[PDB]
Design a protein around this ligand. Structure first.
Ligand code: BTN
Ligand code: BTN
Ligand code: BTN
Ligand code: BTN
Lengths: 122, 122, 122, 122
């Protein structure tokens, strides 16, 4: 939790996310996707468990990125749900949902699901 | 987008979420779950597309809730990814990921997936 | 389980699925999608719990459809995971994963997730 | 497709799956889980695209396992949706949904989601 999360993280696609974990469970930062209809940095906000279990369990967390910034607007938003595992080789393992705004007829195909693993080393 | 999202919403489980959508894509509010290891209100933060398509597409959005408040700490976080559809009968259709902090051995079973539909009427 | 599952079911998109649940947990039948790159009937195969709990729990089941038949080949496959709830108003509630064959570069966006509810009445 | 899929595969949890891919898109075999409420082998059935794209795209496939055999009955079923990528280092990348039979009140938490990567080497 807290201290260990703040920083720059890289995932397997080459995306970068910089976050600051605040004392009372808030996560704020920017995300830069190495793939998709995206360019530059996007604002992200989220929450994490600031009083995790004192056993070897991970710290649960999640964040959202709406893919609109001053350069592009992909009319979609991605939410990452996962846990932070600290130690020598810290990582954040997540599963994500990317929903695009669609008309009612295409709603059935509006959401993509995947998984990303973030490390402090890339 | 914006104006239409702010308010109190209810989903099919009986949970309540009150949010304020700010001018530049931010969502802030509280969530009260009618089920699970939860009690009272939890803080939520998210993002939405503040410049959605002008055709009949929904507005993409997402938010996160870390299930820790002054009464309980379920060491888990839920992220809702979906879209807002306005009109006579406005609704927010979503899919969610609920991840619990686990030890590495139980990580494979750390995440639940489901779907919630929110209406302004309950 | 068994007897109660065999038949024709319809979901909210208007798709039809006809299945036969065999004595030892097998499900065989055809699926006709009302949406997507599909035409006519596709072969489906799956499994279900043929000795479900005797309390009011649902019967877990799942099936797969590869979207290739004599008319079309969408190079994708959908798997539905859910449970059968019997009674006056029987239904099968499911969540599904639709994966398309992609090149390694586009693998991150290869899978769609959604949910379908099947009834014996349409 | 076809020839390349038949065989024994191992995933990162240490589970084993042996399948035979038949000429017209059928997959039959057994699965042995290294984790969960499981013991020994379970029957699996599925489908795959037997006429995949001739570019470097993966072959889409999916299969289901109902966790009931002669030793145990976990009243749950798992469906794996993914694609087969052949070559020197062949693998099947998947995302899965594990649904447990529950009472209507607990249905919201009936499904787990995860991802498994299978190799011919373990
Ligand atoms: O195409 C879009 O809608 C915008 C870019 C989406 C990028 C995705 S979301 C999950 C995955 N992980 C990343 O770092 N990028 C992709
Ligand atoms: O059990 C927990 O970890 C805390 C409560 C979780 C409640 C869930 S998250 C999705 C679903 N929708 C709701 O409104 N509540 C449940
Ligand atoms: O587009 C394709 O790849 C083939 C058709 C896919 C139809 C989907 S799978 C889930 C959803 N439920 C249905 O009945 N049809 C759509
Ligand atoms: O606990 C159960 O219901 C039976 C065992 C479930 C094992 C799961 S399903 C996905 C994951 N991959 C595996 O090989 N095993 C676990």
């Amino acid at each position: 939790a807290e201290a260990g999360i703040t920083g720059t993280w890289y995932n397997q696609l080459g995306s970068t996310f910089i976050v600051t974990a605040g004392a009372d469970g808030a996560l704020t930062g920017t995300y830069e996707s190495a793939v998709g209809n995206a360019e530059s940095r996007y604002v992200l906000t989220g929450r994490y468990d600031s009083a995790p279990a004192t056993d070897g369990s991970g710290t649960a967390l999640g964040w959202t990125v709406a893919w609109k910034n001053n350069y592009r607007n992909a009319h979609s938003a991605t939410t990452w749900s996962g846990q932070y595992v600290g130690g020598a080789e810290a990582r954040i393992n997540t599963q994500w949902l990317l929903t695009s705004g669609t008309t009612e007829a295409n709603a059935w195909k509006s959401t993509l699901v995947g998984h990303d693993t973030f490390t402090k080393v890339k």
